[PDB]
């Protein structure tokens, strides 16, 4: 309400009055009586008293204000009783579709003459085509996984860095403890991106996976060394080391299954939601087919006059909804004990 | 003190015939069994957004009587691990809890703490654990419970911590619930839950076709506001990037 | 003519070579034939005649509307309409200019928008207002004399 001399005490001037907890609600017989104390002066605290005697017939819809003091207007708040249907709310189903078209990817080939096969079988005893099949079969296999990293690079940038939460390996200038235990704080930027994604997408059935460089993902388990007798014959050429590439983690926030791979660049982790509900779909890889053309049929593009092998890989990867976050790990080069 | 429960808004779904013949044939989906479960979930979120507008309104009536800020950023000469600085939030809760039991003289109150699950994660500060990351066994949040519904037992109170993502991140909210039935702080009154399958009721937009109407009548009231707000500052996860 | 769906108006002006956000339920008697924003257009919409700038009727010997003989633009999937249309330009001296029209329309918003890749004057659509929502129908009534 606003009298002829009132201060807002929110935008303090000659304005309204907040009726904090002394509102005038509708009593019996649909009347409104309230003895209220409005402020008048901010530096004076005059607190002029007044009263608002009011009645309104509800079905007759007319109000009736009187007041002993001096009124200018009253800001009211009520609704229309929705007994007689005049305004209800409707709900309807809408349905659209999204296409998962798969297409012909690039086929790789290996031009193979005849007088180069006997030249390798004679001198070096090199099989010319079993060193070219596995050359092709490793090129197509790494073409897939380099595309996956390209897929998660571009289809994170279309989220406009909604979950870009950074991290420093250099502790703060007033930390003053061991920087080995500062790497435990990586787990609270991981669990902070995780809970930030279950709040803007409302899903609770995740299997949040982390892909990252084995330099960067090494800070997550933060494991310590063990020592034994250095016998020179019983050395183990990386016999038990698997926790820098494939490790399971179970926080209090959500569960995890991290992935360490040297193909991604050092300096950034990447969180990906995977839900167990078959209805919801975050990211999906669709491998269509993969077949080898053994020599006959297809020609060559660089030099068509000689026979050649042929191999192609048909696949695509799609993003239905992009729940993907990036943790920028900063100053991780092992130079913390040099500054 | 009066309590009035008024008629609320009707939720109703228009259902023609050809919309049911097409969706059953083209996609095998029902417009009478999916619009109904949609009508229920829309009505079930009015009663959980009214409460958030209620406690935001009721805290504004007290003019910030119990307003105790917490800083996730540690102080400029704290100089230890910033994980255990978040054990300070356990005693900003208990400092404003005992501030309630001192003014309102309560000695039998169970407290409840509602807040964002990003913000209430700081209460247990549970550390990680590790195992083998095999694809054959993926536990899709099998044991995850303590970020939405947590129990507590301090030396100053018991708590029944509630985490839901509908409330905005940045602040906590502590409500006093006394088991003594004479004293009452915040009571929720569900009056009725009425649903009709047409039943003579028409539609507002297109009256010529049948519709399934439903509504629920309810209100929630505050006799005396015992509510506090812990302003958690700088919880954007940038405590390590600074 | 007695029992049937409510036919929309035919003549659409697509001057300037294109039209955008054209209301398709214009000309109808609002209230008992159609209710705008309540009932939709049916998915039987198709164009039976068109008229470019330099066209030929080939029913009369004048530059008029061109009949689309078995190359009408039906409502295709996702409510869009494309068509590679060849039309006669003159009479005996058939120059036969070609022009593609491709377009979309929303059933819910009764809103068409047409764009040709050349020059176009107007078009003659043919569609029915949908009877999914009970807007208007036919009523049988018994009568008796002696």
């Amino acid at each position: 309400a606003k009298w002829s001399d009132s201060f807002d005490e929110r935008t303090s001037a000659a304005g309204f009055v907040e009726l904090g907890s002394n509102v005038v609600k509708l009593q019996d017989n649909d009347t409104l009586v309230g003895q209220i104390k409005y402020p008048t002066n901010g530096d004076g605290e005059v607190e002029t008293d007044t009263i608002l005697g009011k009645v309104d017939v509800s079905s007759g819809e007319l109000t009736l204000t009187s007041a002993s003091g001096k009124l200018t207007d009253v800001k009211v708040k009520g609704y229309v009783a929705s007994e007689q249907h005049t305004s209800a709310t409707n709900v309807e189903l809408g349905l659209t579709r999204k296409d998962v078209v798969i297409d012909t990817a690039q086929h790789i080939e290996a031009t193979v003459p005849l007088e180069v096969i006997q030249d390798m079988k004679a001198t070096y005893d090199i099989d010319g085509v079993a060193r070219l099949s596995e050359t092709m079969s490793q090129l197509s296999s790494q073409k897939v996984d380099l595309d996956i990293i390209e897929f998660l690079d571009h289809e994170y940038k279309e989220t406009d860095a909604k979950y870009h939460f950074s991290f420093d390996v250099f502790p703060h200038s007033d930390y003053s403890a061991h920087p080995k235990d500062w790497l435990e704080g990586l787990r609270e930027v991981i669990d902070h991106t995780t809970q930030s994604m279950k709040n803007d997408y409302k899903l609770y059935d995740v299997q949040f996976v982390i892909v990252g460089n084995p330099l960067d993902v090494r800070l997550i388990p933060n494991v310590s060394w063990t020592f034994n007798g250095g016998d020179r014959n019983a050395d183990a050429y990386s016999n038990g080391i698997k926790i820098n590439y494939s490790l399971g983690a179970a926080s209090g926030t959500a569960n995890y299954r991290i992935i360490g791979s040297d193909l991604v660049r050092q300096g950034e982790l990447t969180i990906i939601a995977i839900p167990q509900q078959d209805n919801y779909k975050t990211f999906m890889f669709y491998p269509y087919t993969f077949n080898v053309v053994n020599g006959g049929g297809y020609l060559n593009t660089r030099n068509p006059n000689v026979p050649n092998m042929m191999m192609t890989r048909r696949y695509t990867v799609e993003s239905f909804v992009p729940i993907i976050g990036r943790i920028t790990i900063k100053n991780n080069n092992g130079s913390v004990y040099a500054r | 003190k009066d309590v009035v429960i008024d008629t609320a808004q009707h939720i109703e779904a228009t259902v023609p015939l050809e919309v049911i013949q097409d969706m059953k044939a083209t996609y095998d989906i029902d417009g009478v069994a999916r619009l109904s479960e949609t009508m229920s979930q829309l009505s079930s979120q009015k009663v959980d957004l009214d409460i958030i507008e209620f406690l935001d309104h009721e805290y504004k009536e007290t003019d910030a009587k119990y307003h105790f800020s917490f800083d996730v950023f540690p102080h400029s000469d704290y100089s230890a691990h910033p994980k255990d600085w978040l054990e300070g939030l356990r005693e900003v809760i208990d400092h404003t809890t005992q501030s309630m039991k001192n003014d309102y003289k309560l000695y039998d109150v169970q407290f409840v703490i509602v807040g964002n699950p990003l913000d209430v994660r700081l209460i247990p500060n549970v550390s990680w654990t590790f195992n083998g990351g095999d694809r054959n066994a993926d536990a899709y949040s099998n044991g995850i419970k303590i970020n939405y519904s947590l129990g507590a037992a301090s030396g100053t109170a018991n708590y029944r911590i509630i985490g839901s993502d509908l409330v905005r991140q940045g602040e906590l909210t502590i409500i006093a619930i006394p088991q003594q039935d004479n004293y009452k702080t915040f009571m929720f009154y569900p009056y009725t839950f009425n649903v009709v399958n047409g039943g003579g009721y028409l539609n507002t937009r297109n009256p010529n076709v049948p519709n399934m109407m439903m509504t629920r009548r309810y209100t929630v009231e505050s006799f005396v506001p015992i509510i506090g707000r812990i302003t958690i500052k700088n919880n954007n996860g940038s405590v390590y990037a600074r | 003519t007695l029992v049937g769906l409510v036919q929309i108006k035919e003549d659409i002006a697509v001057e300037g070579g294109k039209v955008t956000d054209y209301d398709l339920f214009t000309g109808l008697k609002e209230g008992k034939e159609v209710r705008k924003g309540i009932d939709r257009l049916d998915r039987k919409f198709k164009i039976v005649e068109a008229k470019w700038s330099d066209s030929f009727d080939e029913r009369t010997s004048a530059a008029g509307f061109v009949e689309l003989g078995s190359n009408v633009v039906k409502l295709q999937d996702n409510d869009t309409l494309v068509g590679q249309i060849k039309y006669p330009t003159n009479g005996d001296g058939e120059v036969e200019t070609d022009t593609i029209l491709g377009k979309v329309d929303v059933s819910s918003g009764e809103l068409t928008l047409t764009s040709a890749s050349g020059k176009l004057t107007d078009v003659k659509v043919k569609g029915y207002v949908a009877s999914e929502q009970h807007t208007s129908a036919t009523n049988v009534e018994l009568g008796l004399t002696r």
Partner: peptide, 18 residues
Amino acid sequence: MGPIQPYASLSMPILVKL
């Protein structure tokens, strides 16, 4: 319905020319 996207399914015979 209007805002529901129509899916034209595929009937079985392939209608070869003569």
